[PDB]
Each structure stands twice: as C-alpha cells, then as structure tokens.
Design an enzyme around this catalytic site. Structure first.
Site, PDB file in Angstrom:
ATOM      1  N   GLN A  10       0.864  -1.189   0.026  1.00 39.29           N
ATOM      2  CA  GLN A  10       0.054   0.077   0.096  1.00 39.29           C
ATOM      3  C   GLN A  10       0.955   1.180   0.109  1.00 39.29           C
ATOM      4  O   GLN A  10       1.954   1.349   0.737  1.00 39.29           O
ATOM      5  CB  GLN A  10      -0.915   0.001   1.257  1.00 39.29           C
ATOM      6  CG  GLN A  10      -2.082   1.036   1.187  1.00 39.29           C
ATOM      7  CD  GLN A  10      -2.992   0.689   2.450  1.00 39.29           C
ATOM      8  OE1 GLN A  10      -3.960  -0.269   2.221  1.00 39.29           O
ATOM      9  NE2 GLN A  10      -2.769   1.344   3.564  1.00 39.29           N
ATOM     10  N   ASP A 184      -3.237  -4.048  11.976  1.00 36.54           N
ATOM     11  CA  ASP A 184      -2.281  -5.276  12.039  1.00 36.54           C
ATOM     12  C   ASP A 184      -2.870  -5.877  13.597  1.00 36.54           C
ATOM     13  O   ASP A 184      -2.657  -7.106  13.912  1.00 36.54           O
ATOM     14  CB  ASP A 184      -0.906  -5.066  12.157  1.00 36.54           C
ATOM     15  CG  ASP A 184      -0.584  -3.615  12.724  1.00 36.54           C
ATOM     16  OD1 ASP A 184      -1.369  -3.068  13.425  1.00 36.54           O
ATOM     17  OD2 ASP A 184       0.639  -3.436  12.752  1.00 36.54           O
TER      18      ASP A 184
HETATM   19  C1  LIG Z   1       6.892   0.448  13.662  1.00 38.27           C
HETATM   20  C2  LIG Z   1       5.261  -0.408  13.729  1.00 38.27           C
HETATM   21  O1  LIG Z   1       4.819  -0.389  14.650  1.00 38.27           O
HETATM   22  N1  LIG Z   1       4.798  -0.608  12.323  1.00 38.27           N
HETATM   23  C3  LIG Z   1       3.466  -0.466  11.930  1.00 38.27           C
HETATM   24  C4  LIG Z   1       3.006   0.909  11.791  1.00 38.27           C
HETATM   25  O2  LIG Z   1       3.896   1.424  10.882  1.00 38.27           O
HETATM   26  P1  LIG Z   1       4.356   3.206  10.463  1.00 38.27           P
HETATM   27  O3  LIG Z   1       3.820   3.931  11.477  1.00 38.27           O
HETATM   28  O4  LIG Z   1       5.786   3.000  10.308  1.00 38.27           O
HETATM   29  O5  LIG Z   1       3.297   3.424   9.411  1.00 38.27           O
HETATM   30  P2  LIG Z   1       3.582   4.077   7.914  1.00 38.27           P
HETATM   31  O6  LIG Z   1       3.559   5.560   7.772  1.00 38.27           O
HETATM   32  O7  LIG Z   1       5.056   3.525   7.554  1.00 38.27           O
HETATM   33  O8  LIG Z   1       2.415   3.450   7.008  1.00 38.27           O
HETATM   34  C5  LIG Z   1       2.320   1.868   6.673  1.00 38.27           C
HETATM   35  C6  LIG Z   1       1.722   1.738   5.518  1.00 38.27           C
HETATM   36  O9  LIG Z   1       0.455   2.416   5.462  1.00 38.27           O
HETATM   37  C7  LIG Z   1       0.216   3.137   4.172  1.00 38.27           C
HETATM   38  N2  LIG Z   1      -0.320   4.444   4.740  1.00 38.27           N
HETATM   39  C8  LIG Z   1       0.007   5.261   5.700  1.00 38.27           C
HETATM   40  C9  LIG Z   1      -0.503   6.368   6.225  1.00 38.27           C
HETATM   41  C10 LIG Z   1      -1.610   6.842   5.282  1.00 38.27           C
HETATM   42  O10 LIG Z   1      -2.338   7.747   5.511  1.00 38.27           O
HETATM   43  N3  LIG Z   1      -1.988   6.057   4.278  1.00 38.27           N
HETATM   44  C11 LIG Z   1      -1.453   4.811   3.891  1.00 38.27           C
HETATM   45  O11 LIG Z   1      -1.812   4.040   3.008  1.00 38.27           O
HETATM   46  C12 LIG Z   1       1.882   3.114   3.966  1.00 38.27           C
HETATM   47  O12 LIG Z   1       2.140   3.657   2.593  1.00 38.27           O
HETATM   48  C13 LIG Z   1       2.602   1.846   4.338  1.00 38.27           C
HETATM   49  O13 LIG Z   1       2.203   0.887   3.197  1.00 38.27           O
HETATM   50  O14 LIG Z   1       1.631   1.165  11.552  1.00 38.27           O
HETATM   51  C14 LIG Z   1       1.304   0.409  10.223  1.00 38.27           C
HETATM   52  C15 LIG Z   1      -0.414   0.075  10.562  1.00 38.27           C
HETATM   53  O15 LIG Z   1      -0.603  -0.344  11.604  1.00 38.27           O
HETATM   54  C16 LIG Z   1       1.837  -1.170  10.134  1.00 38.27           C
HETATM   55  O16 LIG Z   1       1.974  -1.498   8.821  1.00 38.27           O
HETATM   56  C17 LIG Z   1       3.394  -1.281  10.661  1.00 38.27           C
HETATM   57  O17 LIG Z   1       3.590  -2.576  10.776  1.00 38.27           O
END
Ligand SMILES: CC(=O)N[C@H]1[C@@H](OP(=O)(O)OP(=O)(O)OC[C@H]2O[C@@H](n3ccc(=O)[nH]c3=O)[C@H](O)[C@@H]2O)O[C@H](CO)[C@@H](O)[C@@H]1O
Ligand SMILES: CC(=O)N[C@H]1[C@@H](OP(=O)(O)OP(=O)(O)OC[C@H]2O[C@@H](n3ccc(=O)[nH]c3=O)[C@H](O)[C@@H]2O)O[C@H](CO)[C@@H](O)[C@@H]1O
Ligand SMILES: [Mn+2]
Ligand SMILES: [Mn+2]
EC number: 2.4.1.223
Lengths: 254, 257
Positions: A10, A184
């Site tokens: 995603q 998750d």
């Molecule tokens: C360090 C940790 O605890 N990891 C979790 C944390 O990642 P984390 O806090 O790092 O979240 P990220 O911003 O990296 O986003 C995770 C995923 O969501 C997508 N995204 C994000 C924001 C948004 O508005 N729209 C969207 O589609 C990103 O493109 C990516 O594929 O939260 C996510 C959702 O529970 C989980 O996948 C991760 O395993």
C-alpha cells in the site's frame, strides 16, 4: 502461482520510495506478482513510467483506491493467485535472503503470520492492557521476553486471512476506520482466534532496512482494549520462539 | 504432575564421578520428574548408596544395572518412565537449566520431533552413497546457509513413545547398533522421520552447554557406514533437511536486534 507469493504494498505520498522498493522486490525469487494499493486519491499512478522501464520479472498491478484507508491492503484482490501474501510497508527494504528464508518458514506454518517485527501486549491492571515492545517488562513465565503479535507490514500470511478479515464483526471494521490504525492488531486477534496458536512466528531479519504523530502509539493500546471488549476476551498468546537460518550467516549455530 | 514434566535418562560408563557431578546439577532443573541412570558398568556396584547418603534430593533417581554394556541400553522401555517427554543426555555433557527449560517448552509444541542442541547431517556426492558430517561439509540443500538432517539424542528432548517404537524396529537395526556400539542416535532419527514424515528434529541453539569429557578413529567412519547400512535396511533415505535454528526471544536480552 505454485509455491509463489504475492507482494501487496500500500502506498501514500511515498511514490519515489515505492519505485525504489519495486525495483528491488521485483527481482526476489518465488515472487509471482505485485499489487500496489494506490491510496493517493486523485493522483496518476507511476504505471506508465514503470512500463517504459520494462521489461520486468513479474506483473505489477496498480489498483487506484477510492479513499486513503489503512485497511485497503486487506481487501480480497481477485488478482491474487497465491496461497501466501507478502505484505510490506512502502518504506521498508527487506533483503531477498530474508524473504526467501521467511517464505520457506511460512510454507511450514501457512496458518500463522511469519514476520520480522515482533510486538506484545502487557497488563499491570486487571483487564487493562498496554501495547509495546522490549522496553516493557516480560509478561510470560520466567526469563527472556515474549511477543504476542507480529506486525503485518513486514510479513508473510495466508491469503485466506484477507477474506476472513472481511467477515469480522462490524465493530472491528468501524474501529479500524475510526483510528485508521490497528489493522495489524486486528489481523493478529483474528488469526490467533482462528488457529488457537500464537498469531505469528518471529523470524529475525539479517538485512531489513527502513528508508526515510504523538498519539499514534496511544491508539495502539486503546485498540487492544477495544478489541477485547468487542470480542469479549483477550485471545493473543505469547511466544518466545525466535527463528534464524541455520548456517546463515556461516557458523551462526555456535 | 508427570504431565508437564520430563524424565532424564542418562547412560553411564567409566564416568561415575562425572555422572555424580552432572546429577548434582540436573537434579535441580525445573520440570524434571525423575532420573533414570542406565548403569552400563557390568559387574561394578552402583553409587546409589552414596547418592542416598547425601540426600534428600528433589526427584527420585533410579539406577538400573545393565546386563551388558550396550549403547542401546538407554533406548529400552523403562517402566519407571511416567512422562511423555524424555531428556536424554550423555554423561559428559552439562546443559544449563535455562537451555533445558526453553528446549522443553519447544518440545511441548513439537512433541513428535527431536528437540536438541547438536545438529548434524548426511550428504551425498555420488548417487546412492551417503556420508556423515557437520558444518565442515558443504550444504546439500539448494544453496544458502547450511542444513541439518539429524539432531543427536545425546542432548535432546523426545517423546517416550519413541523408545517403545525403537524396540519394534527391524532386528538388523538392533544388530547394527550392537555391531558398532554406535549409531543409536542415527537410528532414532531415521525412525522418527519415517514415523512423522517431517524432519526428525528441530535445532535449538544452546546458550550454555559444556562438555566435561576431559574432567577411536573408526567412530567417525562407522557413522557414514551406518547411514548407508540403515538406508538398505529401510530401502531408502528418509532423513529430511531443515535449516530452522531456534533461539529464545529476549534471552540474552535484546538478542532479537
Ligand atoms: C513500527 C510499527 O509499529 N509498524 C506499524 C506501523 O507503521 P508506521 O507507523 O511506520 O506506518 P507507515 O506510515 O509507514 O505506514 C504503513 C503503511 O500504511 C500506508 N499508509 C500510511 C499512512 C496513510 O495515511 N496512508 C497509507 O496508505 C503506507 O503507505 C504503508 O504501506 O503502522 C502500520 C499500520 O498499523 C503497520 O503497517 C506497521 O507494521
Ligand atoms: C558429537 C557426537 O557425535 N555425539 C555422539 C557421540 O558421542 P561420544 O562419541 O562423545 O560418546 P560418549 O563416549 O560420550 O558416550 C555417549 C554415552 O554412551 C555411554 N557409553 C559409551 C561408551 C560405552 O562403551 N558405553 C556406554 O554406555 C556414555 O556413558 C554416554 O552416556 O556418540 C554417542 C553414541 O553414539 C551419541 O550419544 C552422541 O550423540
Ligand atoms: Mn513506516
Ligand atoms: Mn562424549
């Protein structure tokens, strides 16, 4: 599609990282297809640029999404032809060696979440849980630590769990959209309820790298408690199993 | 309760002092239900009197005098074994309680497999012929890391149902073990994998295991010989390769990073 896996990624405002990651992931063995869950509502998907730089080892399907919803990557995409799904966030670069090994672990435990990021829940007040990692005291019996969850943003799990996810109580979906988080945590509750075993198994990565909100963590604990209410019980089970590859790196058994 | 426990089966020969030292250690390990000492010193009197004099001990220790000094004596079906899990250890090996407690918990989740600290393998360079060895030999599997097809029983956890099943094996197997006074562990691995259809064992990396031996050239060759011998007896090579290495999450602290 035999003994292969589908990569579901995603993406949101990380297009340049997406292409960089796609350039890496496309070359991983046993990869059958890639499905990009385009959450950039109203933006043109790089598919054009991608094709111009073809050919590519496997098909990459860009699926424009109606809304920027965290749970979009959990839908049942008809294009997924494999029993297993590899779900990685668009800011994580996992080496092929890790993926190949972890996939071979999933094949031996296809009903559990095989991933690189282990987390847990703790409880210091009857019925009230908190979310965390190794900075929090072990819950389990004696020594070492324990995890009760494996984050889906870097894991291999059965594609049937995406359907099963869709069939969860409305309060669960409501909760996910409400917080736009906890997807998750939800997937872990769901899996362990279905198998009765720890939702996942932790595979220690050899080469996994992250390329790059205060109440974001607060919602984590909030969701665990909400899900316990909705499900009328804490189903998560602890495990202290940490899997590594025998001999990789060389002589790591001693 | 006999259920959430395991029985230590230790065979001993010309190491009485080493035995006694190990006993002092193993007797205090959690979840240990009982200890069965397979006395292979034909004609010599056991240390049982000395053991009781220094009592009391946490668990019962049963010294079982043996007819002849046979490697497979420890693979008999002892009526005193009340647990579903057996902890088999050579009388020259000291395994920390930490390793045992963790390994046992792993066995509980994979009760039909050999959970141990010593991984070994078979390799084949000429079609149909097998050789015995360890990490000093190339990997057989596809091509990354190494592989193990056996977990030696001399430091492992395995179902007590297997000691009974071993008695039901082709006489040739019993004869083979008796012929070389070796390969009992290789036979157990053949047995278990033929029974489960899975790798005979799972390797658990020890944190604190030490050999106190200090305190034959054909031994090695017999090993490879036994793999081929057993393959004939079983008209095939049943052993399955595995590259799973299990460690305890958070033990040592932060070892997950
Ligand atoms: C360090 C940790 O605890 N990891 C979790 C944390 O990642 P984390 O806090 O790092 O979240 P990220 O911003 O990296 O986003 C995770 C995923 O969501 C997508 N995204 C994000 C924001 C948004 O508005 N729209 C969207 O589609 C990103 O493109 C990516 O594929 O939260 C996510 C959702 O529970 C989980 O996948 C991760 O395993
Ligand atoms: C690293 C290695 O390859 N380990 C194996 C090797 O250990 P190894 O070569 O070290 O064998 P040991 O001399 O330690 O003997 C193992 C056990 O057998 C007993 N014993 C020995 C000699 C004898 O005449 N009578 C007797 O009963 C010992 O007291 C001990 O409990 O061979 C043993 C027997 O196949 C296996 O248990 C081990 O898994
Ligand atoms: Mn992230
Ligand atoms: Mn020895």
């Amino acid at each position: 599609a035999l003994d292969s896996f589908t990569l579901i990624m995603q993406t949101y405002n990380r297009t340049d990282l997406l292409l960089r990651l796609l350039n890496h992931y496309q070359a991983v063995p046993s990869l059958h297809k890639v499905i990009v869950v385009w959450n950039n509502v109203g933006e043109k998907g790089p598919e054009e640029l991608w094709n111009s730089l073809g050919p590519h080892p496997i098909p990459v399907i860009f699926k424009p999404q109606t809304a920027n919803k965290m749970r979009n990557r959990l839908q049942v995409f008809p294009e997924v032809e494999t029993n297993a799904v590899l779900m990685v966030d668009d800011d994580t670069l996992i080496s092929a060696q890790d993926l190949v090994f972890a996939f071979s672990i999933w094949q031996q435990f296809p009903d559990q979440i095989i991933g690189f990021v282990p987390r847990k829940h703790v409880s210091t007040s009857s019925g009230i849980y908190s979310y965390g990692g190794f900075e929090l005291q072990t819950p389990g019996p004696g020594n070492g630590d324990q995890y009760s969850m494996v984050l889906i943003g870097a894991s291999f799990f059965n594609s049937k769990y995406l359907e099963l996810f869709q069939k969860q109580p409305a309060a669960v979906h409501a909760l996910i959209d409400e917080t736009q988080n906890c997807d998750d945590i939800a997937m872990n509750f769901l899996v362990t309820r279905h198998t009765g075993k720890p939702s996942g198994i932790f595979v220690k990565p050899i080469n996994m790298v992250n390329l790059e909100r205060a109440e974001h963590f607060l919602q984590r604990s909030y969701c665990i408690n909400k899900l316990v209410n909705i499900y009328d019980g804490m189903p998560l089970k602890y495990s202290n199993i940490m899997i590594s590859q025998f001999g990789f790196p060389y002589a790591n058994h001693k």
